[PDB]
Design a binder for this molecule. Structure first.
Ligand code: NA
Length: 177
């Protein structure tokens, strides 16, 4: 039921967050895989939402600690949840996770994590084949650019510019193709 999955994801979150703090890439990978499988097994949007929240918390912690591997693993799992859920809601939630992570990274001078997050935003837009996902991805890039400007993170401002240019140049093809 919903009570068993919530407690399960709670355990996963605890272990994954600790692993993200300590640079334990192997454990972060394993725990995020379990979050994905819990969402799979549950077959509800509620479970998808909770799993994406766990992924977000792990990736935010990782972003704060310069744990590039964990940010990468976590956002890949967000991407896969978006792929497998079969709903627009899951895609929008995954994009909000990516935005949250990229914003925290921008605030912490974590330019790897900004780069990883924006690349997943681009991939979500490329794979979704909806105009709305392209628009939302561009909004994510703008939010990250805004934060980077505010914090004096020139690397992140430049990365956001490059990803914006890529979406603007290439999204025309993504949508038709
Ligand atoms: Na679709």
């Amino acid at each position: 039921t919903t009570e068993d999955e919530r407690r399960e994801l709670e355990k996963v979150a605890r272990k994954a967050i600790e692993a993200a703090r300590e640079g334990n890439t192997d454990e972060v990978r394993e725990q995020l895989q379990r979050a994905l499988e819990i969402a799979r097994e549950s077959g509800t949007t509620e479970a998808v939402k909770l799993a994406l929240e766990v992924v977000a918390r792990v990736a935010i912690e990782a972003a704060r600690r310069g744990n590039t591997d964990a940010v990468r693993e976590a956002l890949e799992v967000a991407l896969e949840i978006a792929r497998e859920s079969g709903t627009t809601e899951a895609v929008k939630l995954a994009l909000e996770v990516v935005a949250r992570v990229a914003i925290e990274a921008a605030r912490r001078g974590n330019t790897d994590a900004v780069r990883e997050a924006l690349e997943v935003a681009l991939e979500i837009a490329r794979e979704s084949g909806t105009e709305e996902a392209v628009r939302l991805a561009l909004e994510v890039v703008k939010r990250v650019s805004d934060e980077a400007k505010k914090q004096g993170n020139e690397d992140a401002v430049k990365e956001a510019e490059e990803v914006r240019k890529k979406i603007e140049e290439e999204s025309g093809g993504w949508l038709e193709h």
